[PDB]
Amino acid sequence: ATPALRFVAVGDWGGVPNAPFHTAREMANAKEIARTVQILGADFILSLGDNFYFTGVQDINDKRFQETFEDVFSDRSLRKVPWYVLAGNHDHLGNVSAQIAYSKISKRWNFPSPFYRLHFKIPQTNVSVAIFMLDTVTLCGNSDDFLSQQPERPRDVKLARTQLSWLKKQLAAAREDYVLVAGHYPVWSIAEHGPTHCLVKQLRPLLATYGVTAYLCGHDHNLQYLQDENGVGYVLSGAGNFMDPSKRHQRKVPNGYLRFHYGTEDSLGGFAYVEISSKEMTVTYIEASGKSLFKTRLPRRARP
Numbered sequence: 001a002t003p004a005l006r007f008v009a010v011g012d013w014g015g016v017p018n019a020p021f022h023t024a025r026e027m028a029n030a031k032e033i034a035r036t037v038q039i040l041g042a043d044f045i046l047s048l049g050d051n052f053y054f055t056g057v058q059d060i061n062d063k064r065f066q067e068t069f070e071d072v073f074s075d076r077s078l079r080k081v082p083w084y085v086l087a088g089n090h091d092h093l094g095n096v097s098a099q100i101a102y103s104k105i106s107k108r109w110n111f112p113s114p115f116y117r118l119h120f121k122i123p124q125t126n127v128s129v130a131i132f133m134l135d136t137v138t139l140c141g142n143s144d145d146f147l148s149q150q151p152e153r154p155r156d157v158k159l160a161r162t163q164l165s166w167l168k169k170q171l172a173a174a175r176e177d178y179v180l181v182a183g184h185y186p187v188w189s190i191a192e193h194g195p196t197h198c199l200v201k202q203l204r205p206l207l208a209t210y211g212v213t214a215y216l217c218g219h220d221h222n223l224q225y226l227q228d229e230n231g232v233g234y235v236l237s238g239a240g241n242f243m244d245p246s247k248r249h250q251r252k253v254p255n256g257y258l259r260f261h262y263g264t265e266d267s268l269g270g271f272a273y274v275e276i277s278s279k280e281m282t283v284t285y286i287e288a289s290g291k292s293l294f295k296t297r298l299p300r301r302a303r304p
């Protein structure tokens, strides 16, 4: 077979605060992600934030770890694959420290700090992949899923500047063959929250300049693929648990960017399956019912 790095990217999967603490959408996604890993393979899973709804977790004794995470993603195959996690606004309404500390309890759960670098090598090749995991809440401010806010400006401006500066240096320095950036809030989205102004100003210009293949996010509760004039991909995967059919911000996204949107009210939701070979990164969007919805290809570039 083609030597490839394979991963699932799933966003906004954090169940509900009413027992049984999961939705049939979350369960369907867990079941389909398990089928995907088992038959197509995966090296890891990325969570794109909003891991526990509506106010994250309190501490490492929080039952939501068991009920919303362990009980749902319980297939032996999702347990043998590492998860790399970042936070959304609803995580920040609780204790993000607790989710970080959970890394010391669960072998598969990796959340070493709010933002961090990941480095992978495609097996049997020299082809490497960096993924920079961001905390867009501390970068941009709070943005409640169920209001139409722009994250105005961060609680701690110094921490926002530190993260942005760390990211600029990481991207400038990165020697990997593919570089991906991941965070909760969208740069571009046609949906309920739409483009995050903070990220359009602060993050977007880094992406093309440093040869970033794609930015991955969730926050808008749907599946989207967008691509800009520099060929940068926007993988939006926020349909692990809820669905939102809004196209409210369709006009706030530059003409020609949107390639694919799925927000159907009667969908079980879905996720993205990413495969990276020496030739291209492909992104396959998979509905929780098991249907392939969209596939797109991003050719390998000569990076700076």
Ligand SMILES: [Fe+2]
Pocket (backbone or CB within 6 Å): 012, 049, 050, 088, 145, 219, 220, 221, 238
């Ligand atoms: Fe969300």
Ligand SMILES: [Fe+2]
Pocket (backbone or CB within 6 Å): 050, 088, 089, 090, 143, 144, 145, 184, 218, 219, 220
């Ligand atoms: Fe969110």
Ligand SMILES: [Zn+2]
Pocket (backbone or CB within 6 Å): 066, 067, 071
């Ligand atoms: Zn249980």
